[PDB]
Structure formats: structure tokens, C-alpha cells
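thread from #wetlab-drylab

HS: before we spend reagent money on co-crystallization trials with magnesium ion, can we at least see a predicted complex? here's what I'd submit
DV: go for it
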Amino acid sequence: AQNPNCNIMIFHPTKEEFNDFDKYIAYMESQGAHRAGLAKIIPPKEWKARETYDNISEILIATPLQQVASGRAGVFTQYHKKKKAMTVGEYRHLANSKKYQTPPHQNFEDLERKYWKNRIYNSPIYGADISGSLFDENTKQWNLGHLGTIQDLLEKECGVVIEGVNTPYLYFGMWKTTFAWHTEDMDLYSINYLHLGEPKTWYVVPPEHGQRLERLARELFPGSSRGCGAFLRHKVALISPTVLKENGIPFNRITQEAGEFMVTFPYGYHAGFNHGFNCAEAINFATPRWIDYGKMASQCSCGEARVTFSMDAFVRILQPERYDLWKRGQD
Ligand SMILES: O=C(O)CNC(=O)C(=O)O
Ligand SMILES: [Mg+2]
Ligand code: NI
Ligand SMILES: [Zn+2]
């Protein structure tokens, strides 16, 4: 078995190897990359996502989210308070203000220590989940707006044509902005490109051990667990590496820098935080190996998780017994 310790693997494809996206994902899996839940891909030196970032300031963040924490430093939830619209140039100036900027630090490890010590005492503002793309249309390789769609994958594997579309999303971050512990909708893959700015630190649990994280979360968030049998789908719970280590949960960590891709694999729980002002692009995707994870994915029916139009068909075809109850939650 390849990668039996479930380490995060880092790949350096050549420009020739960067032509065929599906083939490269399958290659990484042949080497055991999926066992970690997360892999890093450093693009060939010849490749670029676009020519420059000089003209992005007029993108609108219609609904910036202030991430307010409750709990203790290592075990907390966050809720999202909606704020007034602002442009990316306005948000960048806010991120660089004395109130929101990255503090002085020695290295990524010192910064990580400061994040876990101090996160709960501040409420950073995240420009998350903005439909759009920063890849130039002429970028032919690993262009996250030109991937094969999940609906087409389901049709190719299973023969059933379904409605729905699959488009990318932009994320504008600042120091301490946080992504809570989750797997993707329908336990899909994700791919995330850090277009510019400061790093993003990731934590990940191997897919084979995901239920260990779920059991800990039920213990640590006991009211939330009674409320919903899949409350991590709400994307609100944070648990620190120190608390994971105290409770014996297998995990790994890595820091993504500008110019790098990350891939999350089906049922790979992940969480993390931004180091400072940045912009990332991400989208879900599927391969043949996902289908069995999609069939088994948990679902929130309490009504809180409220997701996309395209997830309807995935539930209806892959999970017909659950369909009814899950749709009651969605309506
Ligand atoms: O970058 C973020 O805030 C969150 N991204 C992801 O969870 C992802 O790409 O799957
Ligand atoms: Mg602009
Ligand atoms: Ni994710
Ligand atoms: Zn729920």
C-alpha cells in the first residue's frame, strides 16, 4: 500500500505532465496521495495563472463576513456576521490596517502559535464564496474555470444526465480568517489555487480516520451534536492541533504559499487559517473513485447547512432513500 502513514505529499509536475488534469490526479493517487486527505501541487516554472494581478481592485465583495468566535482558544465555534459591501481594494486596505494586520512574527510556526493563542479574541472579516475566476481564458493547464464538470462525470460513470452547473469561487482573506473543520459537499474533491498574497495553513485528517474526528467533535460540541447528526456540515467548529494531539486524532499540517495548488480528497476533513491579505480560487470536482464516497456521504437535514442547486441531483441519484428528508431540510 503506498503512503501507509498518510503523509501529505508534494508534487512537482513538468509542463508535459501538467497537460492532462485527470491523468495527473490518477497518478497522484497511484502514489498514495489521497490517503493524507490533502496534497500540494507546485506548478511547472513555465506556467502562470494570468499575466498580472494589477487590475483586481474593483472586484466587489457583496457580503463580507465578520467571523465571531465563542468558546475556548482550542475549541470554539464561529458565526458569520454580514457586513456592508466593499471592493477588493477597500478590503485589502482594511486587511493592512493596524486593527487587522498580521503581527510581527519569526516564522510560520511562531505565527501558528499566535493564531491558536489569540484567534478567539478577534473577529477578522473574510470575503468568501464569491462566484468568479482569476484564471486568464488563455491559460490552458489547470485552469479551475475549465475543468470537466461533476455532472458530466456522473453521466459518464452512471449513464444518467442531470441538471446543474459547477463554477469556481474566490476567497479574499486576512490575518486570522478561518475555515472550519469540514469535508466537501457530497464528500467531493476540492482544488484550491492561492493566486496572490500571504500564506494559508491547512490541517487535515486522513479519510480512513475521519470518523475519529467526528466522534471527538460530538464530545466537544455536545449541544450541536444533539441538534444535527452531521453538524460539521454547518462549517462552524474549530479544534486546535494541540487538542487533536491530546485526543489521539491522526492529522497533518502544511502551509500553502502563493502560486501553489492544494487538492483535498473525498472525505478528507480539513480546516485552516490565512496569514494575511490573500486571494484564493477553489472549485469542487469528481473522478470515478468519488462515486462511492458520494453514495455514502452524510447529510445535514436540520436545515442549517443550506447548499447549492446542483447538490439536489447528486442526492436524488446517489442517495434516493435520503432524498425526501434532505430536501425537507433544504425547503
Ligand atoms: O480557502 C478556504 O477558505 C477554504 N477552502 C477550502 O475548504 C477548499 O478549497 O476546500
Ligand atoms: Mg477590478
Ligand atoms: Ni474545503
Ligand atoms: Zn444540520
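DV: The chain has one domain: 1-331.
HS: ok that's useful, forwarding to the group
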